[PDB]
Amino acid sequence: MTDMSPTLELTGVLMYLRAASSHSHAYTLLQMKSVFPALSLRSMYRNKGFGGKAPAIEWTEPRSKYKFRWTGVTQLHDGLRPRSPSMDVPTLEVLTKYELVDIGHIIIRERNAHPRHNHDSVRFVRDVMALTSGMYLVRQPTMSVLREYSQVPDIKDPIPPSAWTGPIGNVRYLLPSVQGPARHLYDTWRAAARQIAQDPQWHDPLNQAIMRAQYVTARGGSSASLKFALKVTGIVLPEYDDSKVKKSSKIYQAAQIARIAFMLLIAAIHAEVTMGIRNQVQRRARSIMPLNVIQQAISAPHTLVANYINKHMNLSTTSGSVVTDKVIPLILYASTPPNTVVNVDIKACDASITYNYFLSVICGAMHEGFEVGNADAAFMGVPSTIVSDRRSSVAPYSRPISGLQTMVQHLADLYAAGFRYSVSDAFSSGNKFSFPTSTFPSGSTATSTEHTANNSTMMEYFLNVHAPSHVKSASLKRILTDMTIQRNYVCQGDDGILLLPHEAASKISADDMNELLTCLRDYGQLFGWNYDIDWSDTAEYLKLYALMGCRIPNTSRHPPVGKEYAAPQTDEIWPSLIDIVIGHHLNGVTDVLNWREWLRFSWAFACYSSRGGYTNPKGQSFSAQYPWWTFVYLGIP
């Protein structure tokens, strides 16, 4: 379909054969995964005969709107050629381990035939990058959960215990005398909490309906834990089994809760949470950690503050997700010759956010930030309560606190206790168990808000404070200043993009870049964030790839044959295959393949799918098939 030279296919065959020869075919492939993109995408135009035409893209003044304008083309020349070092040496060194140096030599030699940027060059890049294995790797869930959540961040300068005030029942406020990034983080969250505090947008009954309704979906989990915990506290929940609906559905548990006074349920938030696993194509499998409805309700302030931080600082860095295509022009602009871009992403944001360093600060800031407000004002059915204040050793006492603060009091307690998951993998045999971890749930988009907020905050402090105080190059200081996140940085969850101000008709010395990148790594190391940065004059953001303003579809991430299945059984009926075909065909259009040949293959797939049958558990069989005109209506020419 991609119409590549047989030589490249030859390399891929040797690639697979070498992997298959050794033990653990999956593991062997996984180790040498990034070899192809590094050999081709990361190093293309590091030579002399450089040139061609490139897009001229302009970013409009209200950069928050993410509006871009195509405004002509730019001639390419040697002064514009990429500055970063190539990737040949590390890749070849790795390939020597598996005695596949021939593959590198073949690829490099073939690559050297494209000194100038044009259709042929990018087409070559597309084809070679399409060689990575497209298999959905799967491993035992028990090993997966044991290997991922067994990590704890390493903080290089922990907050000393003497940096906190007296307790407020559960939380501690941060002493004013403390400075550094933690102080920056504390102030930011506190300021946002203040803005949330007084806001008649809530207590609007319609808005309250939105939040409660947002918590219910067809899927769900942890229902068994819910029923146990409430039955434990003497709460007799209703049941509706005759209404044939799954108990574990978040809908089912929500219906049981409807009548109960909310405060009675408070003891149930400290309950077990089930888990699930979704496999991936080029990485470890993802995790799905659905909280119960009550826990999801309690964590509301955390989400609300995070949303305000996002929507009112860097405009959520596209996390509004209105149409995903807004990132397309962004990376195209970011990859143009006049601009220098750096790809960054937290190594494991889910595993690095934790209570001992991060969440404690946030909880304290939020609890303090909510002090501005009526101490007696119930929120979402959570009434105000009396808590003991022990900030003054000479004059301790107790005072009321608003419902928001009560939520924080419990929320901090839960975070400090750590999440308690229960694994029940079906592929393994009779081995269910439970173990706690500090790993944040991060099962869906609801987590992107918190991580994006913290991501932006730390980056901003690094740019404006830490880096100028610590870097050496005067030229770097000159260019590092006059730079701010709202027009130089975007992110979503762990992923992030940093782009430098246009160096005047020139490019920054790689020496300064190395100095800059090194300091950033150390800065992340301070509070236990492995930044995993790279600089190759390309654009990786939300799994999209751009080179010199041209988008590169990474076809390997959409294997023609591969499809994820997270259960031992496919558990589906024949007609569903049609929708699979339709979705399959569209990818071959989204990714630009040979449109004539792709269409031919698609129809063949449709023909096989057009027919099917079924048999009763004991009785009759049934059969049917569609006339081919159906697929025309479904969208196949």
Binding site: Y149, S150, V152, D154, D157, P158, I159, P160, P161, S162, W164, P167, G169, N170, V171, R172, F228, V232, T233, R259, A261, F262, M263, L264, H270, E272, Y355, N356, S360, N374, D376, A377, A378, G381, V382, P383, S384, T385, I386, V387, S388, S393, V394, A395, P396, S398, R399, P400, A412, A416, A417, G418, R420, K432, F433, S434, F435, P436, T437, S438
Partner: protein, 718 residues
């Protein structure tokens, strides 16, 4: 009839037979005393408050409630929907006491949209378009009220009509909730005093009871406490609990006209002569405790005179601890042991207490117990009991019968409570020392001990840097002193992460999967970093540990390594509000302390889990007899065989995942965790327990390791 308004304290016992006891149990000591009090505080009102709590501000709620008379004579009479309700006036024509026209009634029966006309013009009808205060205003009139909603406040809510009209209009649990109100009333009596949870206008005949403790955070009316207290304060209306015992009420301590020297005042004389053959042969969830004021004195001068001394307040020490030790008021006991340490019983009192403060003010102090202070105390005298009340213990600090880990700073006196206390009895099974886990165990497990390895790495640094670090840690004003301390911290963190974590993770079943484990740790991080499913309680003791460990000289380190480790652990510990460790101790040992006070013998129990012989033989085990083997998971104690048997028919919804190796190391795991509150409060559990075969002679040879699953069933034993 003087009224005393009462706001419950932090762990107020509610299911108690008498609300009165949780206030101050001394009031129950004498018949001549207990006959002077009424209580009121009805349950129906309690439930209403539980609901409305989430919908009214404190000021509004106080403003609404304050006008209600003591015995609520009114009722809320719910009306059924008009189509249903209209039929009632014709099912009994005389019930049409408003005489709504028959034509209108059957017009309503005919209409697709029966209007509110049947409600219209009915006197004192409360539509859903009404507010809380509307009800309360009518409550002061004493007459019953007719309402169109269940969410009402101030009076018991009962159906106006038979249930047939409300059925379909309402559902089962809703139709159930009104049953006590359907026959609500009970009389209220004119004794000298009447306590009440209902607020009221503070005045010459109404008083606010002051207990000097934090409110019940869960109790919905605790938010009123500040406003009530300040109003009472500005008019001198607070009553200390002791005032209630006097023949005539007055706010004050040490009055002229009374010496307050009587058996009624002495809370240490807890007595239980009466009986009723009730199922609670004992309620081991209810624990009586006391707040006491104790005077401390140093050695006399060269002429036999002595300094004025100082008096401190100890909070919520369990009373049975003192009684069982024959402690008596007004006796100057010796405080110091032969080696200068505290006498054991004092240490127990401190450990199980909640807090220690200066008697007058409200400043909490951490007491020293070493040779640090000059003119140190040598004598102690308990002077009076500021308060004496029963408190609920069930599942308060800890939640699961499986295990619990308590974190304490290094240098605590955990050894005393775990050894001396059971040794002081050594006649009734309290615990098994093989089940308690010393916090130092894993550090001792490494072939070179974790301390030795840390020392060996540490000495590589320059001595001056180490010296600077130690001095900085001791000197409180030495803020940060980054260089010296941070370097040491890096070594500590690097080593601990490197060696301790895998070693800890390798002991997972030992910590949790035994019968019942009590464990100690230096920081919650020690467990969280290893993913050990055990509840962790961040405790604290009201004694200075730093000085305490400074007296322990026989260690690997010369008292300097100890303080270094102490600081490292404290730095490693997560920032959170820690709780008093005494509460956990009260939950564990408290019930046992009440054993000697009992009059009748105990009865043993257990919840053995079966084991099919097939898997045992299949695993190479040699076993006699076909019947499935069974293993005791946890033993319990009761004293009323009747109710105990009556409660034994419940089928616990918690399976057991039994695992045992060939070396007979046996382990248990409950797939649904077993919560303590699920245990009926008449039971009694040992602090720790070890799972074991009920009949070891059944087996004849241990084959390979074995695992299996089975249900759980409480059963007697002989």
């Amino acid at each position: 009839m003087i009224t005393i308004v009462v706001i419950p304290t932090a762990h107020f016992s509610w299911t108690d037979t008498n609300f009165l006891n949780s206030v101050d149990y001394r009031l129950t000591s004498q018949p001549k005393i207990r006959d002077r009090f009424a209580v009121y505080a009805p349950g129906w009102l309690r439930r209403q408050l539980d609901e409305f709590s989430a919908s009214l501000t404190a000021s509004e709620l106080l403003q609404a409630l304050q006008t209600i008379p003591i015995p609520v004579k009114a009722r809320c009479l719910l009306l059924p929907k008009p189509k249903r309700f209209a039929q009632w006036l014709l099912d009994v024509p005389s019930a049409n006491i408003w005489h709504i026209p028959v034509t209108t009634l059957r017009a309503t029966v005919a209409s697709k949209h029966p209007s509110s006309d049947v409600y219209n013009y009915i006197p004192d009808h409360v539509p859903p378009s009404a507010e809380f205060d509307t009800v309360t205003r009518r409550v002061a009139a004493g007459r019953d009220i007719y309402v169109r909603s269940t969410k009402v406040l101030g009076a018991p809510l009962c159906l106006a009509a038979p249930a047939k009209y409300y059925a379909g209009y309402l559902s089962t649990h809703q139709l159930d909730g009104v049953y006590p109100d359907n026959w609500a009333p009970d009389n209220f009596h004119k004794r000298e005093f009447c306590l009440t949870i209902l607020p009221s206008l503070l005045g010459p005949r109404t008083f606010l009871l002051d207990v000097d403790a934090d409110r019940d955070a869960s109790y919905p009316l605790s938010v009123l406490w500040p406003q009530l207290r300040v109003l009472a304060l500005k008019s001198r209306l607070l009553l200390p609990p002791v005032a209630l015992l006097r023949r005539v009420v007055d706010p004050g301590l040490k009055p002229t006209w009374s010496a307050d020297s009587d058996a009624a005042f002495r809370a240490l004389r807890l007595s239980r002569p009466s009986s009723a053959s009730k199922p609670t042969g004992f309620d081991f969830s209810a624990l009586p405790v006391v707040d006491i004021i104790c005077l401390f004195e140093s050695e006399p001068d060269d002429h036999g005179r002595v300094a004025p001394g100082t008096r401190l307040t100890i909070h919520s020490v369990p009373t049975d601890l003192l009684t069982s030790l024959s402690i008596q008021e007004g006796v100057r006991y010796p405080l110091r042991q032969e080696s200068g340490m505290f006498v054991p019983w004092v240490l127990l009192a401190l450990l199980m207490s909640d807090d220690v403060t200066i008697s007058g003010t409200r400043r909490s102090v951490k007491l020293e117990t070493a040779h640090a202070s000059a003119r140190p105390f040598v004598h102690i005298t308990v002077e009076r009991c500021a308060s004496a009340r029963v408190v609920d213990v069930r599942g308060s600090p800890a939640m699961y019968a499986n295990a619990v880990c308590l974190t304490l700073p290094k240098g605590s006196y955990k050894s005393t409570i775990i050894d001396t206390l059971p040794a002081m009895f050594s006649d009734l099974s309290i615990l098994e020392q093989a089940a308690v886990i010393d916090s130092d165990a894993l550090g001792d497990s490494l072939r070179p001990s974790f301390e030795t390895q840390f020392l060996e790495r540490l000495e590589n640094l320059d001595p001056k840097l180490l010296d600077r670090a130690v001095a900085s840690i001791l000197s409180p004003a030495s803020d940060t002193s980054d260089d010296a301390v941070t370097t040491v911290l890096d070594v500590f963190n690097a080593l601990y992460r490197e060696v301790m974590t895998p070693a800890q993770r390798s002991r997972l079943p030992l910590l949790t999967q035994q019968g019942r484990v009590l464990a100690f740790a230096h920081s919650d991080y020690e467990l969280l970093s290893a993913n050990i499913p055990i509840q962790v309680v961040r405790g604290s003791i009201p004694i200075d540990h730093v000085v305490n460990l400074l007296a322990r000289r026989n260690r690997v380190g010369g008292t300097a390594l100890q303080v270094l480790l102490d600081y490292c652990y404290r730095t490693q510990a997560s920032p959170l509000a820690p709780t008093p460790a005494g509460r956990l101790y009260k939950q564990l040992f408290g019930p046992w302390l009440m054993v000697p006070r009992l009059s009748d013998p105990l009865i043993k129990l257990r919840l053995v889990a079966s084991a099919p012989a097939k898997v045992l033989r299949a695993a190479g085990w040699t076993i006699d007899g076909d019947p499935p083997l069974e293993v005791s998971c946890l033993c319990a104690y009761v004293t009323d065989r009747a109710m105990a048997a009556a409660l034994i028919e419940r089928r616990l919804d918690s399976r057991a995942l039994v695992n045992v190796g060939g070396d007979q190391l046996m382990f248990v795991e409950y797939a649904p965790p077993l919560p303590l509150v699920s245990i009926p409060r008449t039971f009694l559990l040992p602090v720790t327990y070890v799972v074991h075969w009920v009949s070891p002679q059944r087996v004849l040879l241990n084959g390979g390791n074995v695992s299996f699953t089975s249900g759980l069933e409480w059963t007697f034993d002989d």
